[PDB]
Design a protein around this ligand. Structure first.
Ligand SMILES: CO[C@H]1O[C@H](CO)[C@@H](O)[C@H](O)[C@@H]1O
Ligand SMILES: CO[C@H]1O[C@H](CO)[C@@H](O)[C@H](O)[C@@H]1O
Ligand SMILES: CO[C@H]1O[C@H](CO)[C@@H](O)[C@H](O)[C@@H]1O
Ligand SMILES: CO[C@H]1O[C@H](CO)[C@@H](O)[C@H](O)[C@@H]1O
Ligand SMILES: [Ca+2]
Ligand SMILES: [Ca+2]
Ligand SMILES: [Ca+2]
Ligand SMILES: [Ca+2]
Ligand SMILES: [Mn+2]
Ligand SMILES: [Mn+2]
Ligand SMILES: [Mn+2]
Ligand SMILES: [Mn+2]
Lengths: 236, 236, 236, 236
């Protein structure tokens, strides 16, 4: 199957697959059953920001999600990613809805990865930023229901005339493979930021957004809708 | 055919296609017959650096090539690239040899492109750096004879046991399409740097190296070896 | 006196010192009497963006100022800055009001300077970004009436209870001297962006905002209020 | 006194102040008696690289020091720096010799600091790189014996006709204060890299190099030579 590392912004508690009984941010290593979670209160209709970082010396994957006005939730997990991920990966954003629904709108996304050696100059590095998305982006792979709208936003799941739809799944991956580690590298690091808008006319919302790193040929698994966030074929 | 903008480092004068009678750097817009050239004295066996820049407000494409110890050659040409290039391009390095030959070795390559709007934050941007090349690079498209060697260098044309070979052509393109202009952008700019080593056991060398920007599906044209630098099918 | 290179956003025509009879953007080299201008229509109360760039190979200083919704004005001037500016400079923003007045509010400011040599790695470089300004910024030199407000904006000229005041002048300089050229550099370049809000309850407004580069010990000249934008002691 | 956080490259074991009995890298929080150390074998006469990173979500300060050819040593320490350091700091490099001596030569130094908020755009950020040092650097504060030489290197301690001298101490601080945290910031991070050459004609060498972060008005304490690395007035 795919090899997935993800940070989920999980807006609906599914306690049979080990979610806590509240909305949460989580770090997922090869499974939907998060290795670490923290309570996170979703603000329906407000723009939030997530920042994710990792460095191979520290071996600590951390994420923080915040809204304007002081509310922030952080989660970290110690793991050596060189022994989880393959050498070449693609990075992406995924989201889903199920019975309950929400917009999963991405307003901006930046990512940096560096492979360092014996110099201030990196052996290899990549940095991209999108603060607006093109109508027909040649540098993104859009999967499932993902599309860009006339406002320049990335809509990971279906929205019709301003209302989000049930049972939708979509992902966007950056087109270039990322060289996330190398046997000569002394340090490898990456940092990602994205801003998002989760909104729904309903009080009950689902299912969430995830930032993920996968094998380069990753596609949406069959049966990964709803609680599996378009990332996993099952809940093991 | 392809749409090509290139900066050539031309090591062999072919005066029937309009080269000056000396080695030179040139700016090529859709033709091998450079729109602007400057004399450039190749230092066989030394590492040189090229820096190339363009900004859509200034509308001036400039290049400088230098060797350690003070020797530098610059060339510029005023042109509106929005009316030459398509919206999406790939960027790359090309080189060739013919009857005369040289190594066309690339030691490092960096590129930045930005599309700016009404903020310090770019609408879109891309930056990559390679100070070493991987043995099997998933983020480069290698065409023709191009390969990476065990030292981590990019060899655009064939070298066997340390000697360069005649009648070789090769190119390397960065894998991701680059969004080089957009109808909403207020400014688009790009900057590229690469370092190279042209060496040959012979006093007479050929044919040169070019940095180029092309339509995304660009491939080596038939008959583009030698003086056409792997860029053009003919000398019109 | 000081040595000043500036890009002015001039909101009030003073035709006795050679302004055109309309609002304009201008490039100023050691004098208020701009070497190049372009018509610019100020949108009272809207946030605008300016982008300024220079590269020592191209020898073209360019600026563009734009507002959301497609309105943009550009100006360029060819000049070798190595023969105008000293080796070490400070960079800054200046503004003034006179009989007529406006807010001269800076919302964000970014600057990059690079001195390049024979590598992808710069010999020296500096990049700073402010998207918010601190209440007591230790990394800015504030001169005259300049202050930061409780919203995190930089107010270059006096505002009292939301109204701008007449006969005010203020500047902000970045604290570190910038090494803008070096006798070993093959290329020197800089790029600056800032966003601003010029607003006034009056239909008639003055005097403008300038981005400037000066000798490191530059201070506001006596008598530089109003039309001289806090940059020059006289109109020669 | 000063408030110092430092990463030491300690080339001489002083076991009365708690050094291990071997050369080591260490993380120092307000004291020379390192909170964490790792064995590090100095290669006399070879160029090494150090990389240091911290992020306020992860709260893990990490350092790695490496030489070409695969030899690397890493150390990390978990600490909340917001509760150690003041809001504004200067960053710097320090070194010393005592009875035993070595060159403490810095060949390059890069530093980045970011204060992040609710956007891909940083609230504030600073990045500088030096791959060569100017003869009279206006953007560094040189303290004690520190000087730049005709090769463009930074010599933190005295060298005469290619030989290092005993009982020398010197530091270099970047001129601009760095805004290392802010009460509105969601994340603060910094990353530093430098390359160095420790060489001596003697088999026994001392005392080491440190990267440090201090209160902005930090000066070399009296009696901080030798084992105290120019950082502390005593060994408490
Ligand atoms: C009732 O279950 C359905 O709806 C929820 C909420 O959307 C999803 O988590 C789940 O996978 C199913 O699709
Ligand atoms: C003699 O002509 C051949 O060799 C030169 C030098 O290599 C090339 O420029 C040319 O295209 C031919 O291949
Ligand atoms: C009437 O002249 C005054 O007001 C204008 C507009 O503010 C300024 O340009 C000028 O320098 C004087 O201060
Ligand atoms: C013998 O002690 C002296 O020399 C060593 C080695 O240089 C230093 O660590 C110490 O502080 C003293 O200066
Ligand atoms: Ca869930
Ligand atoms: Ca030729
Ligand atoms: Ca005027
Ligand atoms: Ca010691
Ligand atoms: Mn969950
Ligand atoms: Mn030619
Ligand atoms: Mn004017
Ligand atoms: Mn020690």
């Amino acid at each position: 199957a795919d090899t997935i590392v993800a940070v989920e912004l999980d807006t609906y508690p599914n306690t049979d697959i080990g979610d806590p009984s509240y909305q949460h941010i989580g770090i997922n290593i090869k499974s939907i059953r998060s290795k670490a979670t923290t309570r996170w209160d979703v603000q329906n209709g407000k723009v939030g920001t997530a920042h994710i970082s990792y460095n191979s010396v520290a071996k600590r994957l951390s994420a923080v999600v915040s809204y304007p006005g002081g509310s922030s939730a952080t989660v970290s997990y110690d793991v050596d990613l060189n022994n989880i991920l393959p050498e070449w990966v693609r990075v992406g954003l995924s989201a889903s809805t199920g019975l309950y629904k929400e917009t999963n709108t991405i307003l901006s996304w930046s990512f940096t990865s560096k492979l360092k050696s014996n110099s201030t100059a990196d052996a290899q590095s990549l940095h991209f930023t999108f603060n607006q998305f093109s109508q027909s982006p040649k540098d993104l792979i859009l999967q499932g229901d993902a599309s860009t709208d006339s406002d320049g936003n990335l809509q990971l799941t279906r929205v019709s005339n301003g209302s989000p739809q049930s049972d939708s799944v979509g992902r966007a991956l950056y087109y270039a493979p990322v060289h996330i580690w190398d046997k000569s590298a002394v340090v490898a690091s990456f940092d990602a930021t994205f801003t998002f808008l989760i909104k729904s006319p309903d009080r009950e919302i689902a299912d969430g957004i995830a930032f993920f790193i996968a094998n380069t040929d990753s596609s949406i698994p069959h049966g990964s809708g709803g609680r599996l966030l378009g990332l996993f074929p099952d809940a093991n």
